[PDB]
Design a protein around this ligand. Sequence first.
Ligand code: NI
Lengths: 128, 128, 128
Amino acid sequence: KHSVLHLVPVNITSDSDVTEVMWQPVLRRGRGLEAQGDIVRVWDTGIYLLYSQVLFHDVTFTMGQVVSREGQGRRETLFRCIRSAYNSCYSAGVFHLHQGDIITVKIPRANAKLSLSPHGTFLGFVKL
Amino acid sequence: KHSVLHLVPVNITSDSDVTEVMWQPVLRRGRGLEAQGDIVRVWDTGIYLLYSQVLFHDVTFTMGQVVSREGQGRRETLFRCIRSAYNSCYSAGVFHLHQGDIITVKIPRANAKLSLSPHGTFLGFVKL
Amino acid sequence: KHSVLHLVPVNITSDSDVTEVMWQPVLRRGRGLEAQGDIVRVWDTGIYLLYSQVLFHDVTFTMGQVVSREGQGRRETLFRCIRSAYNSCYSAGVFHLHQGDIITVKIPRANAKLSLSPHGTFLGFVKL
Ligand code: NI
């Protein structure tokens, strides 16, 4: 029976020129993944479907979300979503994640206006 | 072996200031879900991947789709898709659905111009 | 244990008024699917989740991706993604694929400017 994790915002954090989300579980089955604030640690090695929506509010020229992993201190962008007030940006893919990996959802602009609403912005996992 | 349901439009319905789709199955395996017109009833409790695309045609200021569930008469928005002629809006997530739940895909504007085409607009389920 | 395939660009091909991608595997488990250049052959009949992102660069009026299958020489559009410089377009669905089927990701404009970057443009499969 599939291990799953669906995360929703609690607050939006930002000197570093990026903006992140503190995540909180609303659905969790199995336990090879743990949200710890603005990241999600991977504890069980496997292949995962990973999906991310971000609902943007800014009037900025360009914005989007960047989903990455960092293993032995050397980061990789898994996927990203990009779009030129209110606008959601969805992307997802399937990826080999290892124990020790950290997963992030960053936005490369500082102080980005995003929806905290759980049906607008959310991150999720299905172990396959 | 995974239970799945992929639904495609048959017609577009609208006094209530919303617009809905009458859905029809093109792929179905297993049987804990049943489309009944503009809704999909849930009969088998479980965790489901749920995905929704809507191809919009309107020149309106803002539009998008709103995917919700109603159990004991108290609705919850699971996720939504939003964008500022021809434009598709995709979103998806994983959610705990219970038997008795009704699933809807509504658009909060009246008489919304949407594609009926099965490759533009579609709703789907994978029991996990 | 689920069979999966995640493909990323190697080059972008185009007299025919369309543009395609030559794909390359970065994740592969099981073996009922094979990328052969700009297509992916299906060898194991089954139900698959199929997802496609394309990151566009053009300043064109309209563009998007068209994911189709061809069995006995008679093509069907499974799904498509559409949007009116830098912009990603994501869609996905679940579909019954048969052995012998060819899967394509085409863009109906000639010489389309797309990102080759693996985190911007990508095609993927999960056998269910
Ligand atoms: Ni399974």
